From a paper:
The ATP binding cassette (ABC) transporter of mitochondria (Atm) from Arabidopsis thaliana (AtAtm3) has been implicated in the maturation of cytosolic iron-sulfur proteins and heavy metal detoxification, plausibly by exporting glutathione derivatives. Structures for Atm family members are currently available for ScAtm1, the bacterial homolog NaAtm1 from Novosphingobium aromaticivorans and human ABCB6; the pairwise sequence identities between these homologous transporters range from 40% to 46%. These proteins occur as homodimers of half-transporters, where each half-transporter contains a transmembrane domain (TMD) followed by the canonical nucleotide binding domain (NBD) that defines the ABC transporter family. The translocation of substrates across the membrane proceeds through an alternating access mechanism involving the ATP-dependent interconversion between inward- and outward-facing conformational states.
To further look at substrate binding, we determined a 3.6 Å resolution single-particle cryoEM structure of AtAtm3 purified in DDM with bound GSSG. Although the overall resolution of the reconstruction was moderate, we were able to model the GSSG molecule into the density map. In this structure, AtAtm3 adopts an inward-facing conformation, with an overall alignment rmsd to the ligand-free inward-facing structure of 2.9 Å and a corresponding half-transporter alignment rmsd of 1.6 Å. This opens the backbone hydrogen bonding interactions to create the binding site for GSSG with binding pocket residues identified by PDBePISA. The binding mode of GSSG in this AtAtm3 inward-facing conformation is similar to that observed in the inward-facing structure of the GSSG-bound NaAtm1. The binding pocket for GSSG identified in this work primarily consists of residues from TM5 and TM6, with additional contributions from residues in TM3 and TM4. The GSSG binding site for AtAtm3 largely overlaps with that identified previously for NaAtm1 and for the binding of reduced GSH to ScAtm1. The primary differences between the two structures of inward-facing conformations of AtAtm3 are in the relative positioning of the NBDs which are more widely separated in the apo structure relative to the GSSG-bound structure.
Author numbering:
A (entry chain B), B (entry chain A): 117 to 175, 186 to 716
The structure:
């Protein structure tokens, strides 16, 4: 429909590149070489016919011949050289177009990928995020196959059949056009019908094979239980049954393919025999001459070869079309959150976080935020404490605008968040994840990831302040090693130290931490507490802690219960008033 | 070498199956149809030559072929009928042989699986499961492809070229044999060389695409940290770099394939043109060569077609040979533990387990079994307690003879383990694993797995006694549902109850348990303890328990420390003597 037209137009735009001339030149060369190859391929049997007729008459009063070629040996040499020229033209065409095909594939894949990171995370959380690369790869392969086929096989064969039909309609009677048209029409319709029939058999084969492999894996993995009793009496029988089903499916597929091939051969053989016998009648009558039989045979045989893979190319074209449709469906996906055009840049004159009756529900069945109204002063450290249902994990998401607030407003530095560019707030906010992930690269790059275009002395002094430099010096190579998976293993405390180094390199105005739960010694806990205190020395900070013992360090404490505020203030006055926070101590510290 | 001869002989033995004639007849039919198809294919151009010669002479010498065909139209009809007959013979041959190929592949796969499922447990630990299934599938595909190719393409093309070179070098000059020999020799050597060079290029190509896909996965899965800062920055550039590498490799591969194709085309074109020119010289000289130029052209062209996939078939044959070698390497693997020829079935008269200074070490650098010599009376309950390093998890393996004792003696009912039939002890021992795995089948099958060929009422009463009938009555469907993966989840207590019901159905003479650690309420704990007591009411038992609160239920208790015995006897005398068991209670029960 309209979507298909849009996809075709987009593909044409990504194939033309009007800005540069090299690709236009290459496309022109491709079409030129295609036409030249087809013309030479048609002209070869004419040379063979001329040679045969001349030899037959010897044992030809023409202007062109007897001057360019002195003897029939020259004509046969020209036959060979014309075949070679046709092959060389096909060579050049396929290489020249393949280059541009690869270029456009690369451009399309990069565009889709870069758009994929632009979309919000509610999209990513919906699915498994591992099949997206599968779709990308499948669509790239589909683009490659469809372009290569549509430019190398479908068009050249149409040109070939057009030339054959035209050159037989002329120079002969009109019956040859009827013969070739009917033959190719019946051939095409038969091939399409049998392919549509065989697809079901192939799909039946694949599922049975996959089931047999899955049963084999399940049987092998559970070795000890199978060896505990009933040793091998039962499992081999069921594996044999699955193998028998696979065998039956394969046999049926092979039989159907054989039938298809036999039908195609019959159709083309009867077409060729009818053409040659009619030519023989013509020669016997006296209107024609020997050699036209040879020319007709050779020309029909030349036409035969490209039409031998019609079923395979049709099936693969259908599959590639479906895959291309899916990949382009990944695009043109809207974003729930967007930035207004009239937005104002964010100014940082001293962070003043203010919340005013924020309501939110990730799923409408359950509401997890109920009118939170906490206010963070300038240069003060606040803490959020509660249970799992207190909804503590979403506060940083809201402050970073991962999920837009259903109702209510936020004053950051006396400014609303909705009508400012998200880039400024994303650049002015630093975060410490619960479980930081280390990239499959060197340590220095991971430390530098906090802020690109940074000098080496900066990251060196940041690591020194984080007190990780001494730990780095113990590795086999200084400030360089494969870390993460498929490499050196780094401790969780060291991992969160790396995360602290990143957020210190970024040097933001507001920091948010989460204090991930881990089994840590007292000395390391004190060291990381000192590091965090140094990080939040002169910045507005909002902390959430799983372990309350670390939460007394903040100036002010707010307790959240079931998505609603209960009490606020320092811990000592919470003892004095014996509020909910006191009961939180009662079952925590005892 | 010798292994290659062995695998070829084994494959031939599987392919023949002299016992049943239904496969000998099929093989004979396959060879007959192959020979007939090749004969007809070579004979096709001769009819065209005869028709063309007769037609040219018409516009007379009698070769005594006027009786079969009255007019040249009959010969031209015979041309097509011979082509159709050749195609029919080919497809009959391919179907008839594919049947036997699909039989032998299944037989080989089942045999290899059954043998692989019989090796020792040490081999299964060493190799990563799933790799075995991958090797099995790859080798099966290798068998299928190598048999199909070696019977459908390599042999028929050799016959075709031999018979073409036999039709030539007779009825013509001797130079035709030289041409059709050296041309095909040069063709083969050139194709092999360029095929090796291209396969090196392709092996270089694949890795770049794999790396690009892996990087896409890694970049996408770690979305939140990328969105925290420097979003859509360095990642897009790196992905561009990887796609650029892949594009360069693909372009190089395409160019290499193009060059190979052009070389093959030019070689065959020059061979064909030389043969044509020599035949033209012959016909002009006035020799017996008259109008048979078309015969030579058609015969060489027929020979050309099968030789257009030599590189692909060679590369795939090499790969399939490697995979076949891998599969047949999985076979002929010795088992560490074997049963002696003088072994006898074990007779039970009341289990008496006796240990005599058993020494064992899984890896020689660390010894975990050091001379344990406990003796279990008839119809008594013995408990083993200790720490993680005590080695409590291997006594059941030794008594079940998963491994073998390095130096020691095991006396069961006054009989030695080593020189008795192992099937008897496998059948006379029942075990309760820590984490039993429920098969992805119906619940009734999983319960019946304990003892095959068992009546449904026995299974029903066994489930009822295990106090599971009430629980299993509460699923939406009774006695039939999908359980385990891809099905409804089953509780850990329910899973343990299923295992207990299974081992109750087995009804052995000696039972061993492990008391897997799991959170559980008091009522269900008492219920499963009562069930275990009922199971071990009148049988010798070897209990090991993570929770020591359940250990005094047994009659006698033996404590193990660092793979050595410390004290033995009931708990009251352990308290009286104030042995290690007192410390176990003090730092365990407090
Ligand atoms: N160019 C090399 C030959 C190597 C080559 O080109 N190999 C082909 C294999 S096409 S193999 C494709 C084949 N097609 C068919 O079988 C068509 C059957 C149809 N129904 C009919 O009418 O006959 C098929 O897959 N059938 C499945 C089935 O049997 O069910 C290729 O694509 N190479 C790519 C590369 O080298 O990079 C040379 O000349 O030396």
């Amino acid at each position: 429909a309209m979507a298909d037209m849009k996809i075709l137009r987009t593909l044409a735009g990504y194939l033309w590149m009007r800005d540069n001339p090299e690709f236009r030149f290459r496309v022109i060369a491709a079409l030129g070489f295609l036409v030249g190859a087809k013309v030479l391929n048609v002209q070869v049997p004419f040379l063979f016919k001329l040679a045969v007729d001349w030899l037959a008459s010897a044992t030809a009063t023409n202007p062109t011949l007897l001057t360019v070629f002195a003897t029939p040996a020259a004509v046969l040499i020209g036959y060979g050289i014309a075949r070679t020229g046709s092959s060389a033209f096909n060579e050049l065409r396929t290489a020249v177009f393949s280059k541009v095909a690869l270029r456009t594939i690369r451009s399309v894949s990069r565009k889709v990928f870069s758009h994929l990171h632009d979309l919000d995370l509610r999209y990513h959380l919906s699915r498994e995020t591992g099949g997206l690369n599968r779709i990308i790869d499948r669509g790239s392969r589909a683009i490659n196959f469809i372009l290569s086929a549509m430019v190398f096989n479908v068009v050249p064969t149409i040109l070939e059949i057009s030339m054959v039909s035209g050159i037989l309609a002329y120079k002969f009677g009109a019956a040859f056009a009827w013969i070739t048209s009917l033959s190719v029409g019946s051939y095409i319709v038969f091939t399409l019908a049998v392919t549509q029939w065989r697809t079901k058999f192939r799909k039946a084969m694949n599922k049975a094979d996959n089931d047999a492999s899955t049963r084999a894996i399940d049987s092998l993995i559970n070795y000890e239980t199978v060896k505990y009793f009933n040793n091998e009496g039962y499992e081999a029988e069921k594996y044999d049954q699955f193998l028998k089903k696979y065998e039956d499916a394969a046999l049926q597929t092979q039989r159907s393919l054989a039938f298809l091939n036999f039908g195609q051969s019959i159709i083309f053989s009867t077409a060729l025999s009818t053409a040659m016998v009619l030519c023989s009648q013509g020669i016997m009558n006296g209107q024609m001459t020997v050699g036209d039989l040879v020319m007709v045979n050779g020309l029909l045989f030349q036409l035969s070869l490209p039409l031998n893979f019609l079923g395979s190319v049709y099936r693969e074209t259908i599959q590639s079309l479906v895959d291309m449709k899916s990949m382009f469906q990944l695009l043109e996906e809207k974003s729930d959150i967007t930035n207004t055009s009239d937005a104002k840049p964010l100014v940082l004159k001293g962070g003043n976080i203010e919340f005013e009756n924020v309501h939110f529900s990730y799923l409408p069945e359950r509401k997890i935020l109920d009118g939170i109204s906490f206010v963070v002063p300038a240069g003060k450290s606040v803490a959020i404490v509660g249970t799992s249902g207190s909804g503590k994990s979403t506060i940083l998401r809201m402050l970073f605008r991962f999920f837009d607030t259903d109702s209510g407003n936020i004053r950051i530095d006396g400014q609303d968040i909705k009508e400012v560019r998200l880039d400024s707030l994303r650049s002015s906010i630093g975060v410490v994840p619960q479980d930081t992930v280390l990239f499959n690269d060197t340590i220095f790059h991971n430390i530098h990831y906090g802020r690109l275009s940074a000098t080496e002395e900066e990251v060196y002094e940041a690591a020194r302040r984080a007190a990780i430099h001494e730990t780095i010096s113990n590795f086999p190579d200084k400030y360089s090693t494969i870390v993460g998976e498929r490499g050196l293993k780094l401790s969780g405390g060291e991992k969160q130290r790396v995360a602290l180094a990143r957020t210190f390199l970024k040097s933001p105005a507001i920091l948010l931490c989460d204090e991930a739960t881990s089994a840590l010694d007292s000395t390391t806990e004190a060291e990381i507490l000192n590091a965090l205190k140094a990080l939040a020395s002169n910045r507005t900070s909002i902390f959430i802690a799983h372990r309350l013992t670390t939460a007394m360090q903040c100036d002010e404490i707010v307790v959240l219960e079931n998505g609603k505020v209960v009490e606020q203030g320092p811990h000592d006055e919470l003892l004095g008033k014996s509020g909910r926070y006191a009961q939180l101590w009662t079952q925590q510290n005892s």
